[PDB]
Paper text:
We employed the scFv of the anti‐human osteocalcin (Bone Gla Protein, BGP) antibody KTM219 as a model antibody due to our familiarity with its properties and crystal structure. We next solved the X‐ray structure of the Switchbody in order to obtain structural insights into the trapping mechanism of HiBiT. The crystal of the Switchbody based on the KTM219 Fab belonged to the orthorhombic space group P21212, with unit cell constants of a = 95.84 Å, b = 65.91 Å, and c = 69.56 Å, and it contained one Switchbody comprising a heavy chain fragment and light chain per asymmetric unit. The structure was refined to 1.95 Å resolution (R work = 20.2%, R free = 23.8%). Moreover, structural conformations of these heavy chain CDRs differed considerably between Switchbody and Fab alone compared to light chain CDRs and both chains’ framework regions (FRs). These results suggest that the HiBiT is mainly located near the heavy chain CDRs and does not tightly bind to a specific site on the antibody in the absence of antigen, similar to the behavior of the fluorescent dye TAMRA in Q‐body. Although the HiBiT interacted with heavy chain CDRs near the antigen‐binding site in the absence of antigen, it was moved out of the antigen‐binding site in the presence of antigen. In addition, by combining these contact maps with the X‐ray structural analysis, we considered that HiBiT interacts with multiple sites in the vicinity of heavy chain CDRs rather than tightly binding to a single specific site on the antibody. In particular, the MD simulations predicted the salt‐bridge interactions between D52H or D54H residues of the scFv and K9 of HiBiT. Therefore, one of the key mechanisms for “Trap and Release” of HiBiT would involve the interaction and antigen‐dependent disruption of these salt‐bridges.
Residue numbers in the entry:
A (entry chain L): 0 to 27, 27A, 27B, 27C, 27D, 27E, 28 to 211
B (entry chain H): 1 to 52, 52A, 53 to 82, 82A, 82B, 82C, 83 to 99, 101 to 213
């Protein structure tokens, strides 16, 4: 079957000016019969195409900063960034072109590290305008938190809601390095009118214990 | 200067086909192989196949054989990829790439959206501030921009004048096949009713512009 490239870690928090190290391992040897090892490193910035940094293990691609260096032993590989800058932030991918089909690792996100920040949590009932129309969206906002990991749990009269909500998260903030998250719970007007307590429970590393924000209609 | 210039976004129905293209320049087209790569949330980066323009020889990822067809037009130095029998699984960004030898640069990507939906402008609902949206001295408010197709919608606040504390979230695809998005902003609690807040929503694919006031 196809060669599997496994990257580590999944997410790498650094401070600007730190050294960064990222790993990629291959389920097969990537040594070609021609003596070369076709293991390549890319950086993808948000909304941009992947950009080639290192090719065939350690060859710095012409015009890539000297602070990027590639190393490794035929199946275990490492990308090092000696002095991390803001231009270096994004997702790093390894890929192999030794054996068809060519394959990619799952990516490692290089992001800015900051102190834990508990989310500010806000809940919005559906508007009367929307209820007229026939739907009820309840929105819970988790504002300016770090790290990214957050659990939102919707409860309607203590009934745990499952499968009827969708979440969306911003990219890390340019200034404060936080994330924000919106979660929408969709109900029918009929169902929304049948219940009283709408609760958004938020679990985050930065909080003492999970916080709940609710309203009663 | 090697340049790979890909064709524009595609919006097609399940079962249809699309032909993506990638115009190249700044190198000898006939002497280097062209690859195509898929990027999707579900499967990450996947290599599709390669083509040698010199003799038209091609080689595929068995996962995409007979899904994807690679060709070239040597007069224009353009590479193409035909995708057939489309399903929601094919909704992805598709890149065309050159050889490492010519720099191994990638095109910009072409987004393909496979959907039954037709063009539809959003409804815009307020997310009013209340006590439920007030953590001490800061209040949150926003607009819910619901049930539009396709992406994107734009949202500004107070006609570009308000930008501090604005978060416009990525759209989500609802099980109905229509998108929904929220845009929020945090403001000084004491500003409410003194300062007006308006979300300027624009959905160009349906020519839908809406300015929505948001108040307690």
């Amino acid at each position: 079957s196809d060669i599997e490239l496994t990257q580590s870690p999944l997410s790498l928090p650094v401070s600007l000016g730190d050294q960064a190290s990222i790993s990629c391992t291959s389920s097969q040897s990537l040594l070609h019969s021609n003596g070369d090892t076709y293991l390549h490193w890319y950086l993808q910035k948000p909304g941009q195409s992947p950009k080639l940094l290192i090719y065939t293990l350690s060859n710095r691609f012409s015009g890539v900063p000297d602070r990027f260096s590639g190393s490794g032993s035929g199946t275990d590989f490492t990308l090092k960034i000696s002095r991390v800058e803001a231009a270096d932030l994004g997702i790093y991918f390894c890929s192999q072109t030794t054996h068809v089909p060519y394959t990619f690792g799952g990516g490692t996100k290089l992001e800015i590290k900051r102190a834990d920040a508990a989310p500010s949590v806000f809940i919005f009932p559906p508007s009367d305008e929307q209820l007229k129309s026939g739907t009820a969206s309840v929105v819970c906002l988790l504002n300016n938190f770090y790290p990214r990991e957050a659990k939102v749990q919707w409860k309607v009269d203590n009934a745990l809601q499952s499968g009827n909500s969708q979440e969306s998260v911003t990219e890390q903030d340019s200034k404060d390095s936080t994330y924000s998250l919106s979660s929408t719970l969709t109900l029918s007007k009929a169902d929304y009118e049948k219940h009283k307590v709408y609760a958004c429970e938020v679990t985050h590393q930065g909080l003492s214990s999970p916080v709940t924000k609710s309203f009663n209609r | 200067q090697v340049k790979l210039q890909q064709s524009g976004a595609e919006f097609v129905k399940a079962g249809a086909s699309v032909k993506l293209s990638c115009k190249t320049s700044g190198y000898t087209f006939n002497n280097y192989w062209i690859h195509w790569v898929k990027q999707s949330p579900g499967q990450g980066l996947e290599w599709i196949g390669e083509i040698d323009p010199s003799d038209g020889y091609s080689n595929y990822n068995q996962k995409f054989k007979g899904k994807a067809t690679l060709t070239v037009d040597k007069s224009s130095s353009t590479a193409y990829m035909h995708l057939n029998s489309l399903t929601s699984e094919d909704s992805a960004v598709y890149y065309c790439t050159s050889s490492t030898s010519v720099g191994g640069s990638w095109g910009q990507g072409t987004t393909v959206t496979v959907s039954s939906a037709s063009t539809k402008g959003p409804s815009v609902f307020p997310l009013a501030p209340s006590s439920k949206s007030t953590s001490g001295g800061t209040a949150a408010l926003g607009c819910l921009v619901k049930d539009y197709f396709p992406e994107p919608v734009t949202v500004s606040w107070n006609s570009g004048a308000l930008t501090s504390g604005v978060h416009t979230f990525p759209a989500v695809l609802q099980s109905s096949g229509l998108y929904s998005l929220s845009s929020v902003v945090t403001v000084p609690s004491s500003s409410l009713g003194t300062q007006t807040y308006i979300c300027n929503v624009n959905h160009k694919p349906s020519n839908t512009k809406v300015d929505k006031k948001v108040e307690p």
